[PDB]
């Protein structure tokens, strides 16, 4: 049994504070089990901690390509199907080593007072857009949006041509403020510290809920899935799995949309919200066609190769 916490590594700010409101309290109520909410999730965090052999993290929330990483250097315990019971979440989800929980979009969003009539990805990157510019700390979503400011067909992104996404970025990088994690931005949206940002859905609407004068549109957006995880040598990797099983059901799936505006991967939590929430989610057919869903496959193959470009590269 649980004679400490369950430790959970996740991504901090507006999203931590929902997975904790969905999730972590009510497993912690329902078990009886004592739930804590960490920060530091990622690839390079996992891999420096099961490789060291002194794992403090018994459950990962993963984005596709830090999962697809993970995977690849054997970093996961295989996910206990005899525990985690789910069949309405679809089988593609339910992969060995991970359970995928959530469908997040990642948009363009801007500051109303400075751009009252919106910002499309080609401004974001038009030099001549004077503006406070925000990207995401990694590769990853940053070249996908780059591409699709830039023209590429969002039916054309895969295989990435990172050539060019980098020569795009080339284009505003005098004006891009920082490459940052998604608490980090929220804050700056909330501070009024940028104006043009590409950040995940929820975290976009969580800061206009908390009086931030913000926009957004779907145009180049990127969809990804994000993943319940356990490190290999988590200490409670039994009690995740519980965990796990726990998130994954109707109605804390349907709880997590409710405060944040991120989708379930539970077929059965949709019926359960507001019919307006499908028109907030990636998935719905109009937002869809404007942008992309990130390609797990290709950042899987790709992803060393183009992390030892882009740390050279957001370093000048
Ligand atoms: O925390 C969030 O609201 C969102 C929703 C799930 C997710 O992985 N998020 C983080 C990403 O949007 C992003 O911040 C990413 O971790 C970094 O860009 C590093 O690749």
Do not use: C
Not at 94 to 106: H, I
Request: no cysteine; glycine share 8%.
């Amino acid at each position: 049994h649980m004679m400490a916490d369950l430790v959970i590594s996740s991504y901090g700010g507006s999203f931590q504070d929902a997975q904790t409101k969905a999730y972590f309290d009510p497993y912690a109520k329902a078990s009886g089990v004592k739930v804590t909410g960490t920060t530091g999730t990622g690839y390079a965090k996992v891999k420096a901690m099961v490789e060291s052999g002194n794992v403090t993290w018994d459950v990962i929330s993963a984005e596709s390509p830090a999962f697809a990483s993970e995977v690849k250097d054997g970093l996961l315990e295989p996910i206990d199907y005899s525990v985690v019971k789910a069949d309405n979440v679809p089988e593609n989800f339910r992969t060995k080593y991970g359970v995928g929980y959530m469908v997040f979009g990642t948009n363009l969003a801007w500051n109303k007072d400075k751009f009252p009539n919106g910002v499309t990805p080609a401004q974001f990157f038009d030099p001549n857009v004077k503006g406070r510019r925000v990207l995401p700390s990694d590769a990853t979503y940053s070249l996908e949006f780059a591409l699709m400011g830039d023209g590429v067909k969002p039916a054309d992104l895969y295989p990435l041509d990172v050539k060019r996404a980098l020569k795009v970025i080339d284009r505003v990088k005098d004006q891009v403020i920082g490459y940052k994690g998604a608490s980090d931005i929220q804050a700056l949206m909330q501070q009024g510290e940028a104006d043009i940002v590409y950040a995940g859905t929820g975290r976009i609407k969580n800061a206009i809920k908390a009086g931030a004068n913000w926009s957004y549109s779907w145009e180049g957006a990127l969809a990804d899935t994000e993943y319940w995880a356990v490190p290999k040598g988590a200490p409670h990797a039994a009690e995740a799995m519980k965990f796990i099983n726990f998130a994954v059901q109707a109605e804390p799936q349907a709880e997590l949309t409710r405060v944040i505006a991120y989708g379930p991967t539970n077929v059965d939590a949709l019926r359960l919200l507001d019919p307006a929430v499908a028109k907030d989610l990636p998935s719905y057919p109009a937002n869809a066609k404007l942008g992309a869903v990130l390609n797990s496959k290709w950042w899987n193959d790709n992803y060393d190769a183009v992390k030892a470009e882009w740390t050279t590269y957001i370093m000048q």
